[PDB]
Design a binder for this molecule. Structure first.
Ligand SMILES: Nc1ncnc2c1ncn2[C@@H]1O[C@H](COP(=O)(O)OP(=O)(O)OP(=O)(O)O)[C@@H](O)[C@H]1O
Ligand SMILES: [Mg+2]
Ligand SMILES: [Mg+2]
Length: 371
């Protein structure tokens, strides 16, 4: 019961009032494990993360190449949550983002101060964002090792530290547009991803194919719910997580998207490089400035956690200052700077929504090629 000023999502506010217990209540599901990995031939390791080791394999009946995510020990409800979210997203018969746009059903937060953040531009067309969500094929648990495991669609992915430096301006615009479609869809489904970052974005470059993976930290959005702030990874944590504003929403994903984008555009990786939890906030404020930070704390009447009282006064760094000859081919236009500026805001309510971001001028060359 931490928050003083209450906050609600600007968009898609009431999805989980519309949808009921059988959709969002992951704790009261029972996982239908497959008793055997007999349907699969498990090959070599293709990746890892904080919560898993991931192995390439083949589904023997169809010969489809898959991955198997072997889950490290965690609370069992986290496993139920990942499975529920993945199945909700894949099993929706008519993805809401494929339907005709309805503004009154979109901008659902009707507070006067929140409505001022509606942008003059918006992508208002149906889209295939649901097709950018990784597909879960099976749930398996070996009888001998007792290891819970998730079988997914395989993506032929290269580490971002190898791929991203090779990408052209137009290719970054393309892929980041694909990511926004995925986010618009999961948000429309009343779900926050909460771990948006390069390692969780599979790209098969030769097939121009993008998948948003790793749904293990995702959560259902409920109006005025206070969430744990110890989620995501240090470098991608929004200001709300650092100052312990627990009543956050889908906009957290857009901060993460923005920080990922800022890294690609300015070629500084990671963009906010904190040496500790404390210093992570310092790295952010060093950029956005102390002045707007304090206005933000005042707006929500946030009592700053104890650790941040040794913070110095910082003058805002204009984005222009991040431009240099190494990156100017990606950063040297007004459009990208304005996009980044409108994503990376202290106040979560101020940030572009996925749909607004998709309608931003920077994506014009991508939108042009849709029809
Ligand atoms: N479908 C896939 N195709 C190819 N590689 C994958 C796939 N799924 C996962 N991987 C690889 O395995 C890694 C770990 O998977 P994932 O991100 O789902 O697990 P995690 O342990 O929850 O990660 P995090 O530490 O970000 O929470 C990924 O970063 C990726 O490199
Ligand atoms: Mg991951
Ligand atoms: Mg959104």
């Amino acid at each position: 019961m931490k928050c003083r000023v209450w906050s609600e999502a600007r968009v898609y506010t009431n999805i989980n009032k519309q949808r009921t217990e059988e959709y969002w209540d992951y704790e009261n599901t029972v996982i239908d494990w497959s008793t055997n990995t007999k349907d699969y031939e498990i090959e070599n390791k293709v990746g890892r993360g904080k919560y898993s080791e991931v192995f390439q394999g083949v589904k023997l009946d169809s010969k489809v190449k898959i991955v198997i995510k072997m889950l490290k020990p965690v609370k069992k409800k986290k496993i139920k949550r990942e499975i529920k979210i993945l199945t909700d997203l894949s099993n929706e018969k008519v993805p809401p983002t494929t339907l005709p746009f309805q503004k009154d059903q979109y901008y659902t937060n009707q507070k006067e101060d929140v409505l001022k953040f509606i942008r003059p531009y918006i992508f208002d067309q149906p889209h295939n964002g649901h097709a950018n969500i990784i597909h879960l094929f099976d749930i398996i648990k070996d009888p001998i090792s007792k290891t819970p495991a998730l079988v997914f669609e395989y993506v032929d992915n290269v580490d971002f530290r190898i791929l991203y430096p090779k990408l052209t301006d137009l290719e970054i615009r393309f892929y980041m547009f694909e990511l926004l479609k995925a986010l618009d869809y999961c948000h429309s489904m009343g779900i926050m991803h909460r771990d948006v970052k390069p390692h969780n974005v599979m790209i098969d470059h030769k097939n121009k194919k993008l998948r948003l993976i790793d749904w293990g930290l995702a959560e259902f959005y409920h109006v005025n719910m206070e969430y744990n702030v110890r989620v995501a990874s240090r470098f991608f944590k929004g200001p709300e997580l650092l100052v312990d504003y627990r009543m956050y929403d889908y906009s957290l994903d857009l901060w993460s998207f923005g920080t990922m984008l800022a890294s690609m555009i300015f070629k500084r990786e990671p963009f906010f490089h904190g040496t500790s939890n404390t210093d992570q906030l310092v790295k952010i404020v060093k950029v956005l400035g102390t002045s707007d930070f304090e206005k933000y704390l005042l707006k929500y009447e946030i009592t700053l956690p104890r650790e941040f009282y040794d913070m110095d006064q910082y003058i805002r760094k204009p984005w222009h200052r991040f431009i240099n000859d190494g990156n100017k081919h990606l950063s040297g236009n007004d459009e990208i700077i304005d996009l980044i500026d409108n994503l990376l805001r202290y106040d979560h309510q101020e940030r572009l929504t996925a749909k607004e971001a998709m309608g931003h001028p920077w994506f014009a060359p991508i939108r042009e090629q849709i029809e």
